[PDB]
Design a protein around this ligand. Structure first.
Ligand SMILES: [Zn+2]
Ligand SMILES: [Zn+2]
Ligand SMILES: [Zn+2]
Ligand SMILES: [Zn+2]
Lengths: 49, 100, 453, 385, 100, 50, 295, 65
């Protein structure tokens, strides 16, 4: 009949395609200067108004 | 319709003789015969375990980037003949994707 | 189970009884009234679908078409129907009729299989029993009382005939199936351990085994006459024969007709002739494996407080002689308060048998009172007390045997243990004291092995 | 002085068998059953696409002993039926799950049309603790920012369900009403016990309704009315182009295991990997992925087919039942058009087009699944053919 | 027991969303830093469902309300005594600025 | 020490509280007077308001 | 213990069956009744407590062959689950008693239908969409009574023999979604005529669109594949796999839609070349036709 | 067999004791036995089997009826 069945499991939602980052102190500051140097003006978006 | 209705009233016409019983058994022999040619049964998916270990991130991330960049290409496809949302800065961006 | 497992399922008992019959009797069994019974009694779809395959095919097919019909994700269920294929004993595996290991069914059974499904003829509408064109024109509620009287007489033989004086030979008939036990100090038979459960579910499935009990002798009784006669009451009511069975009968047909009428499945008119009409209990035999009924309000209700289990009282004339047959309870001044000091009365009945699952079945499933009104489990903490009373009879053992003592070596006693174990006369062994108990039935064989080694 | 009144009280309560002779409990039952109200409201909209953001309350008031001792398992369990029924009649549309706890509005699921993603996500909220202090302005301002990205052609209504707290107004929500109207969005509020007046005006200015649940059977009936789109008509929301019409494929020829199946590793459909049997593909991009009507990731539009996608929205469109006509002569064929047999117990329902008589089992199936009349095939296409 | 008080310079630009998540920051270095695409394509369809919900929690001061959503929690916060009580990690003294 | 206020304090069973010998549990960062064999907490406080 | 039900939709078309005998065929209208004689008996052989339901498809209506609509099987039902007022034939179901009476009603009911076919109204074809509208109303009436204790596991069998007519094909799709709520299975058994609407009933609910080659080989594809037990149909594999695929295109337009847009805000799926309205009385802004017409 | 209320009597005995309701004492029938017990000694009332009732000695210092 029953008497201590088991577990329902029902596991889903998986990912983990690789590492999450070897470092996060020196390389992070390197990418911040690239975005600041590239952004020098404006005129963005999908033409609003 | 009246001529074919006379054969329906006589129930003894399709009660004792079984002409369709012999021909129905012949279709079962040809059905199993056509199912025999199948050497690829339970063998066409033997490369499903290694397909998620060798690429890992080299091909998995590149595959998701093709549909991500390609999504904005269709939106920009209709932004060329209108000549109102077009931007001259995205001209170099289109040539960079073709050369890459 | 002590002899009732084959009664709950009908398709399993028919396959087991068919394996031990005569080859000439099985040939006459393969008839048109038996085709609608070997499939209707089944339950799995795989065992029932193979019947239609052997009907259209005229040539034997090899096993290659069977291993491919399961495609790829169905061979697991194929092994379950493998053992059932040998139960009916109707197929036959040839050598190589057109491939490899050709499977074919008995053509004697294939001819009668199409008569009761597709084809036809004339002899099917001429014989009685299986047909008998006759309608009903008699008071139905008046005949329902006789169906209960046929089963009430059997209850008198289980107790000891308190007021019955009939000449029906039903005490020895039930003793062969392990239901009734002959009294040693007296002469009226009582009841066995498996007989208590029969008086609880009240299902007509047991009456089907009583019809095939006389056929187990395998002397001058045939199955083709019993199978064609048992099909009468299987068609519910409005299935008679007026007087057609009187013209077409013999001395063997009258013997099985008198035994079936006393069981409670068919009613017969006076002088054991004229018109016969099946009872109402035969409808539940073809419906399912069990059944319920007989009450409209259920006045009985037990107690789930203490531990002596106050049984239900005030119902009808059926539960009066039923509780006393179980363990003989007590009654006080009012309307027969049964089961009020249950402490010594239950142990009196357990000394003659391990009747432990029948008391629990009667305590839990008696009329469905608590499981419908209340909610928690019916038995409180008596599930452990009942097991204690059964262990009290295991403290001793009354068996005979001989003991061998005074040996010489230790490796020599180990060889003697295998002699009594293979023959089946060994009970208990002891390698620390070099002692072995041998039953007196095989005492003349163990002494010969010791004188040779 | 207790026994002086307790002894005389038992004398009256013991003679309770005299009250059963009067037909008080019987005459009311037959009169309360005949009370059949009729307020047919034309709840229908021509707009097929719908965007909804269901707000689920997660405060400490979700544990009161009302319909059941555990209110937390009453809203989460019954919401799974609303999600499954939403994709049954409107598979092309999608909903959203937004919870509110610890004075914050954390968006659980995104804006996707995956029925399995929304059902399995509600089971995780069982272990979620109920702190308290719900916030309505937080769960409503975030839903407008995400909904703003959708093009103007849908009803873009918002559903809010809370535990009927005494005015769930954080800090003057009336100032937000003037802002929510500029976004052309709609707010729907459902009550459970006490009345909420601060949300009744919000449901009227934006465009919706306000109802309070009275019993467990009333909560299921109200969710059925929300399956249909809200009845409205605007002029600034009627422009849309490029509709995705995918086709169903099997990705095989004879055997599924002999082929690399569908939704594997190397296949471009890396959104929901696993081991399926078939799916859809864009006719303008040939991108095979899950067959669920979701927004693709190569074009920027949802999938609106025709067989079992766009037809589900049109199947719910003919919402109409049948009328009745009494008589004192016992006449009217008494032969059902669908099941032949009737009931013969004062139950005569005729049609307004073909005039067919039905029974009690056929009229219920019409207003629930059939949505039309079988006699409209053997009468209306008759003269045109 | 004790508690921690964060002392780090904050920002208001969209770059804060990538710095707080080291896992999400790895994707920005594989597409923009790797000069394979343009910076405008990443902030369009690839990252749009996450930056929208994360923009509301960049200026959220505990609770926006004061009449119901915050009045039920202002009672244990307006008890500025000594004994043994201590502040928490979040800005607990901000409620005094809204009242005094 | 790890400078984290570790090691859960000693838990003492059966403690009276105005003719109520309930149970006072000493967890990590807060006190909880658990009312006998139950799951809730009657006297609920922390290691600050004392 | 357990009961079943099988609803057979017979496409009895006097026009198609009347011309098939000219092409030297052995399976005409007289032999089409034999299919019910075999399938109706094999269904009761597995369980004698089953029920039979046969619905025809004539060019004027969908007459019920069993039970009929006359004064014999109309008001009083001859089902085996009604012992009173029906027991001279409903008592020996285990052979050829009740099974013969079940086929006799079909022969008695078809007498009024064959004689009422003067074909004087030119040609109207068979209203095939109206056949499934009557099967759902019959399985729902018996389910409300059998919902207690028993469950009654049934299916839906459709036998196609001709094309359609001037009927609106939208009515044929209403019975598909109305049957998915009850968790029922719909089948299809074509003979010569092929249509894309009947195949949709096998893909939505999960049925099987079987194509019958020759006519006399009909008893094989209706007993094992079209088994009302539907217990081993997931691992049966007998008919060939589905190769072709037919769905739906435009509603009131002569083109195959794949990216087109509706008229405005209604449901009439048309095309993308429509700056204004088409066949309705609505409007449409000029903020998109100038964009789509360019490219 | 008629109605559920027209049942569960007292079960009179030739000795001098009756068996009242004890299966479902609830709140209504819990007060009917309080007057019946106000005559003999107090039997175990709060049970589930059957409530015992007699008439001896105590029928004096009980109620006033
Ligand atoms: Zn696409
Ligand atoms: Zn009806
Ligand atoms: Zn109509
Ligand atoms: Zn239109």
């Amino acid at each position: 009949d029953m008497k201590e069945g088991g577990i329902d499991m029902d596991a889903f939602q998986e990912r983990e395609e690789g590492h999450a980052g070897p470092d996060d102190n020196e390389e992070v500051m390197r990418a911040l200067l690239i975005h600041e140097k590239k952004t020098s003006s404006a005129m963005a978006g999908s033409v609003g108004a | 319709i009246i001529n074919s209705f006379q054969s329906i009233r006589q129930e003894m016409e399709a009660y004792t003789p079984k002409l369709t019983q012999v021909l129905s058994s012949s279709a079962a022999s040809s059905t199993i015969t056509a199912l025999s040619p199948g050497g690829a049964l339970m063998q066409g998916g033997t490369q499903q375990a290694i397909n998620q270990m060798v690429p890992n991130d080299i091909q998995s991330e590149l595959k998701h980037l093709y549909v991500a960049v390609g999504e904005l290409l269709r939106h920009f496809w209709s932004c060329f003949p209108v000549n109102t949302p077009f931007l001259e800065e995205k001209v170099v961006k289109m040539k960079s994707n073709l050369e890459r | 189970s002590r002899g009732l497992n084959r009664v709950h399922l009908q398709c399993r008992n028919l396959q087991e009884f068919l394996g031990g019959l005569s080859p000439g009797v099985l040939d006459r069994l393969y008839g048109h009234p038996a085709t609608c019974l070997a499939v209707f009694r089944e339950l799995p779809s795989l065992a029932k679908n193979w019947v239609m395959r052997m009907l259209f095919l005229e040539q034997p097919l090899p096993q290659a078409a069977v291993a491919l019909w399961v495609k790829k994700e169905f061979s697991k269920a194929q092994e379950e129907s493998t053992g059932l294929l040998s139960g009916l004993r109707i197929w036959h595996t040839q050598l190589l009729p057109g491939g490899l290991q050709g499977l074919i069914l008995n053509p004697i059974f294939r001819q009668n299989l199409r008569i009761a499904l597709l084809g036809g003829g004339k002899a099917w509408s001429d014989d009685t029993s299986q047909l008998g064109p006759d309608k009903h024109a008699r008071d139905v509620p008046s005949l329902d009382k006789y169906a209960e009287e046929r089963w009430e007489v059997v209850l008198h033989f289980m107790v000891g005939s308190p007021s019955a004086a009939v000449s029906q030979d039903l005490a020895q008939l039930l003793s062969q199936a392990g239901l009734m036990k002959s009294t040693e100090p007296g002469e009226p038979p009582c009841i066995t351990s498996a007989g208590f459960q029969f008086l609880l579910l009240d299902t007509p499935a047991q009456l089907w085994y009583f019809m095939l009990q006389y056929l187990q002798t395998a002397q001058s009784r045939g199955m083709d006459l019993v199978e064609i006669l048992s099909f009468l009451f299987q068609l519910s009511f409005s299935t008679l024969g007026k007087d057609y069975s009187v013209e077409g009968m013999s001395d063997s047909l009258l013997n099985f007709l008198q035994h079936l009428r006393e069981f409670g499945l068919v009613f017969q008119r006076k002088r054991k002739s004229r018109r016969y009409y099946p009872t109402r209990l035969a409808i539940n035999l073809s419906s399912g494996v069990s059944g319920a009924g007989g009450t409209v309000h259920q006045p009985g209700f037990i107690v789930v407080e203490t531990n002596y289990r106050l049984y239900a009282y005030t119902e009808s004339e059926l539960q009066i002689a039923l509780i006393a047959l179980f363990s003989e309870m007590l009654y006080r001044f009012p309307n027969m308060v049964v089961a009020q000091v249950t402490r010594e009365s239950v142990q009196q009945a357990i000394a003659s048998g391990i009747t432990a699952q029948q008391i629990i079945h009667f305590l839990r499933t008696r009329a469905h009172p608590v499981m419908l009104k209340q909610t928690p489990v019916l038995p409180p903490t008596i599930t452990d007390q009942i097991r204690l009373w059964e262990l009290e009879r295991d403290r001793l053992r009354f068996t005979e045997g001989v003991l061998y003592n005074q040996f010489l070596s230790q490796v020599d006693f180990e060889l003697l243990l295998a002699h009594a174990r293979e023959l089946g006369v060994l009970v208990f062994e002891n390698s620390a004291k070099r002692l072995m108990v041998v039953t007196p039935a095989g005492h003349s064989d163990v002494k010969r092995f010791w004188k040779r080694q | 002085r207790w026994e002086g009144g307790y002894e005389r009280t038992w004398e009256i309560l013991k003679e309770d068998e005299s009250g059963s002779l009067k037909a008080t409990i019987e005459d009311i039952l037959f009169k309360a059953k005949r009370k059949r109200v009729f307020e047919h409201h034309g709840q229908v909209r021509l707009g097929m696409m719908r965007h909804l953001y269901v707000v689920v309350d997660g405060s400490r008031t979700m544990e009161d002993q009302d319909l059941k001792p555990n209110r937390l398992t009453c809203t989460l369990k019954l919401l799974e039926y609303f999600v499954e029924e939403y994709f049954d009649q409107n598979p092309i549309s999608q909903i959203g799950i937004i919870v509110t706890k610890s004075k914050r509005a954390e968006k659980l699921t995104e804006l996707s049309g995956n029925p399995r993603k929304h059902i399995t996500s509600l089971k995780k909220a069982v272990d979620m603790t109920c702190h308290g202090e719900p916030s309505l302005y937080n769960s409503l301002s975030i839903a407008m920012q995400t909904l703003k990205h959708m093009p103007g052609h849908t009803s873009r209504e918002v559903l809010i369900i809370f535990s009927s707290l005494t005015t769930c107004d954080p800090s003057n929500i009336y100032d937000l009403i003037k802002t929510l109207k500029a976004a052309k969005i709609r707010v729907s509020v459902i009550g459970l016990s006490a009345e909420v007046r601060v949300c009744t005006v919000l449901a009227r200015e934006t465009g919706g309704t306000y109802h309070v649940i009275l019993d467990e059977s009333h909560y299921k009936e109200l969710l059925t009315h929300h399956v249909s789109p809200p009845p409205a008509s605007s002029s600034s929301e009627c422009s849309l182009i490029r509709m995705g019409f995918p086709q169903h494929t099997i990705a095989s020829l004879s055997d599924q295991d002999a082929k690399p199946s569908f939704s594997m590793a190397h296949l471009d459909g890396n959104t929901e990997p696993g081991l399926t049997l078939g799916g859809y593909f864009c006719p303008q991009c040939r991108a095979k992925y899950c067959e669920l009507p979701v927004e693709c990731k190569i074009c920027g539009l949802t999938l609106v087919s025709a067989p079992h996608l766009a037809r589900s929205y049109h199947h719910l469109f003919p919402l109409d039942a049948f009328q009745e006509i009494p008589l004192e002569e016992y006449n009217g064929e008494r032969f059902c058009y669908g099941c032949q047999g009737e009931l013969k117990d004062q139950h005569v329902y005729v049609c307004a087009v073909c005039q067919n008589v039905f029974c009690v089992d056929c009229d219920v199936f019409v207003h629930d699944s059939l949505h039309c009349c079988p006699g409209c095939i053997h009468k209306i296409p008759a003269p045109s053919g | 027991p004790k508690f921690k008080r964060k002392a780090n310079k904050e920002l208001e630009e969209k770059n804060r969303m990538l710095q707080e998540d080291p896992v999400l920051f790895q994707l920005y270095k594989d597409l923009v830093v790797s000069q394979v695409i343009s910076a405008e394509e990443f902030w369009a369809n690839r990252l749009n469902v996450n930056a929208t919900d994360s923009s509301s929690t960049s200026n959220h001061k505990q609770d926006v309300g004061i009449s119901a959503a915050f009045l039920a929690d202002v009672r244990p916060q307006t008890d500025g005594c000594n004994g043994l009580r201590y502040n928490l990690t979040s800005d607990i003294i901000e409620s005094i600025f809204r009242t005094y | 020490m790890a400078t984290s206020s570790e090691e859960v304090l000693l838990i003492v069973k059966k403690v009276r509280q105005k003719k109520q010998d309930g149970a006072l549990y000493l967890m990590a960062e807060r006190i909880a007077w658990a009312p006998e064999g139950k799951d809730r907490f009657t006297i609920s406080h922390m290691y600050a308001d004392i | 213990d357990e009961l079943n039900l099988l609803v057979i939709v017979v496409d009895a078309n006097p026009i198609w069956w009347g011309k098939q005998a000219l092409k030297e065929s052995q399976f005409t209208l007289s032999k089409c009744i034999d299919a019910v004689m075999v399938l109706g008996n094999s269904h009761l052989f597995m369980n004698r407590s089953n029920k039979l339901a046969v619905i025809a498809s004539h060019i004027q209506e969908s007459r019920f062959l069993y039970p009929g609509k006359n004064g014999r099987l109309g008001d009083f039902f001859g089902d085996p689950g009604n012992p009173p007022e029906f027991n001279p034939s409903g008592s020996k179901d285990g052979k050829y008693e009740l099974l013969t009476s079940a086929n006799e009603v079909i022969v008695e009911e078809i007498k009024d239908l064959m004689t009422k076919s003067d074909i004087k109204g030119q040609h109207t074809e068979t209203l095939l969409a109206g056949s499934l509208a009557k099967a759902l109303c019959y399985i729902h009436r018996m389910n409300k009574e059998v919902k207690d204790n028993q469950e009654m596991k049934s299916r839906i069998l459709v036998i196609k023999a001709a094309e359609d007519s001037a009927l609106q094909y939208m009515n044929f799709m209403n019975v598909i979604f109305a049957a998915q709520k009850q968790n029922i299975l719909i089948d299809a058994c074509v003979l010569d005529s092929d249509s894309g609407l009947l195949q949709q009933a096998c893909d939505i609910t999960g049925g099987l669109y079987l194509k019958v080659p020759q006519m006399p080989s009909l008893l094989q594809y209706l007993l094992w594949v079209f088994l009302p037990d539907q217990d081993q149909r997931s691992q049966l594999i007998l008919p060939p796999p589905v190769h072709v695929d037919y769905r739906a295109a435009c509603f009131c337009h002569r083109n195959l839609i794949e990216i087109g847009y509706v008229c405005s805000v209604c449901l009439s799926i048309f095309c993308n070349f429509s700056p204004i309205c088409t066949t309705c009385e609505t409007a449409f802004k000029i903020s998109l036709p100038p964009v789509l017409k360019a490219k | 067999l008629k109605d559920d209320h027209t049942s569960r009597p007292l079960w009179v005995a030739p000795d001098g004791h009756i068996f009242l309701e004890a299966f479902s004492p609830v709140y209504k029938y819990a007060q009917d036995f309080l007057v019946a017990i106000a005559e003999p000694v107090c039997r175990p009332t709060h049970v589930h089997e059957y409530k015992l009732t007699a008439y001896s000695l105590y029928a004096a210092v009980s109620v006033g009826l």
